[PDB]
Enzyme design. Sequence first.
Site, PDB file in Angstrom:
ATOM      1  N   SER A  84       0.813  -1.155   0.000  1.00 57.22           N
ATOM      2  CA  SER A  84       0.000   0.000   0.000  1.00 57.22           C
ATOM      3  C   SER A  84       0.883   1.255   0.000  1.00 57.22           C
ATOM      4  O   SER A  84       2.020   1.158  -0.301  1.00 57.22           O
ATOM      5  CB  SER A  84      -0.894  -0.027   1.192  1.00 57.22           C
ATOM      6  OG  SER A  84      -1.805   1.008   0.989  1.00 57.22           O
ATOM      7  N   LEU A  85       0.364   2.439   0.244  1.00 53.77           N
ATOM      8  CA  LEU A  85       1.191   3.600   0.284  1.00 53.77           C
ATOM      9  C   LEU A  85       1.018   4.421   1.524  1.00 53.77           C
ATOM     10  O   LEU A  85      -0.033   4.616   1.989  1.00 53.77           O
ATOM     11  CB  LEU A  85       0.859   4.527  -0.862  1.00 53.77           C
ATOM     12  CG  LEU A  85       1.223   4.215  -2.283  1.00 53.77           C
ATOM     13  CD1 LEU A  85       0.481   5.091  -3.243  1.00 53.77           C
ATOM     14  CD2 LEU A  85       2.690   4.297  -2.511  1.00 53.77           C
ATOM     15  N   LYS A 116      -3.010   9.897  -8.695  1.00 56.63           N
ATOM     16  CA  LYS A 116      -3.521   8.789  -7.948  1.00 56.63           C
ATOM     17  C   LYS A 116      -4.922   8.534  -8.395  1.00 56.63           C
ATOM     18  O   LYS A 116      -5.717   9.342  -8.205  1.00 56.63           O
ATOM     19  CB  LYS A 116      -3.497   9.026  -6.446  1.00 56.63           C
ATOM     20  CG  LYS A 116      -3.523   7.769  -5.613  1.00 56.63           C
ATOM     21  CD  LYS A 116      -3.545   8.064  -4.153  1.00 56.63           C
ATOM     22  CE  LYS A 116      -3.976   6.886  -3.283  1.00 56.63           C
ATOM     23  NZ  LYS A 116      -5.397   6.574  -3.210  1.00 56.63           N
ATOM     24  N   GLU A 177      -4.560   0.335 -12.016  1.00 52.17           N
ATOM     25  CA  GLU A 177      -5.816   0.662 -11.458  1.00 52.17           C
ATOM     26  C   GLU A 177      -6.954   0.516 -12.478  1.00 52.17           C
ATOM     27  O   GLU A 177      -6.836   0.985 -13.555  1.00 52.17           O
ATOM     28  CB  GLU A 177      -5.797   2.078 -10.923  1.00 52.17           C
ATOM     29  CG  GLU A 177      -6.779   2.307  -9.828  1.00 52.17           C
ATOM     30  CD  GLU A 177      -6.278   1.857  -8.502  1.00 52.17           C
ATOM     31  OE1 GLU A 177      -5.144   1.556  -8.385  1.00 52.17           O
ATOM     32  OE2 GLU A 177      -7.005   1.851  -7.587  1.00 52.17           O
ATOM     33  N   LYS A 293       7.007   9.525  -6.363  1.00 48.44           N
ATOM     34  CA  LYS A 293       7.914   8.441  -6.307  1.00 48.44           C
ATOM     35  C   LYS A 293       9.334   8.730  -6.710  1.00 48.44           C
ATOM     36  O   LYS A 293       9.553   9.329  -7.703  1.00 48.44           O
ATOM     37  CB  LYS A 293       7.475   7.336  -7.255  1.00 48.44           C
ATOM     38  CG  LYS A 293       6.015   6.985  -7.218  1.00 48.44           C
ATOM     39  CD  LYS A 293       5.610   5.836  -8.090  1.00 48.44           C
ATOM     40  CE  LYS A 293       4.137   5.586  -7.976  1.00 48.44           C
ATOM     41  NZ  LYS A 293       3.566   4.781  -9.002  1.00 48.44           N
TER      42      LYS A 293
END
Length: 321
Positions: A84-85, A116, A177, A293
């Site tokens: 997860s983040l 996101k 996603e 990131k």
Amino acid sequence: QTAPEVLRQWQALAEEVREHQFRYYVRDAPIISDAEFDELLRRLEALEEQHPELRTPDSPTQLVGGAGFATDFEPVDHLERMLSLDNAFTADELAAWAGRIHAEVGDAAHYLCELKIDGVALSLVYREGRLTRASTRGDGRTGEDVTLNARTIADVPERLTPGDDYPVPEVLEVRGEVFFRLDDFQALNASLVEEGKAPFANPRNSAAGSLRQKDPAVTARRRLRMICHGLGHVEGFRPATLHQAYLALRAWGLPVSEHTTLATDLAGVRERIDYWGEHRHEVDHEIDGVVVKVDEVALQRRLGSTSRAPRWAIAYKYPPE
Ligand SMILES: Nc1ncnc2c1ncn2[C@@H]1O[C@H](COP(=O)(O)O)[C@@H](O)[C@H]1O
Ligand SMILES: NC(=O)c1ccc[n+]([C@@H]2O[C@H](COP(=O)(O)O)[C@@H](O)[C@H]2O)c1
């Protein structure tokens, strides 16, 4: 043991036949003619008569002529653990994360800023350029098999496109996603209500439900989309950076987002965050934030991860839309 050529021929023919069965029945989208398919099946049937041990209940022939295509959500392992983040909700939190990064790897880190997407996570596996498995997150180590459903998503290619620059990897686990575009979400709700069914409260719930169908033909009828945002286990591919990795995904035919940018330091990151804060409403799908990131793979290795998330990434989340 059956003779090697016989077994080879059967396997190849059965796979080709099953694929067309899936394309015709589940997706309502054949890729060869009805005549072509018929000769194919005739041939498989002939081969099986000559060698009756090959006729099994699983054969595309003996049993499965109507269909045999159901999803049962059986547990399947990921090749690399899906994490997860960690989140950041304020400027201070983000700055603190950046500082920590600076303390470990100095000014050698650049930052990939991605949108996101607030959808459903999906992990795909391609073996020798071919889609073999797609699964949900589950607990991170093990998710549920929704391979058939994923095979109906237009954006997910069955096979990877070979390219000059980027050879097809031996094994590629790619994370993405799954989501609905807003207009499609409304349309789906209208259609559901027309059949006496309850509508979904939001596009995320709607994507999840559409994805998770025991009968993949239901999924095929819905306009799910997918954008790839990461990599799990990979063989035969060593990208120096995540951004360069995205170029290979593109060359191979995988779907990637056009809203990603490469910042060099925290000021650049801050600019993208402020920008998408103002303009995320213009994107046709839900964006709950920006994922920051460290771009350099080697730096990602160094920073590592905890049991729950990477130390090399952070999700800056906005206030609810
Ligand atoms: N661009 C992205 N990069 C990585 N993860 C993303 C991205 N977009 C959506 N996600 C999803 O965000 C999830 C973690 O989200 P959360 O629990 O809300 O902080 C990931 O595990 C992914 O499934
Ligand atoms: N063009 C195709 O890919 C395709 C595939 C499977 C079935 N069909 C059609 O449906 C019937 C064939 O038997 P099956 O029902 O297994 O597929 C035939 O009408 C056939 O032509 C067509």
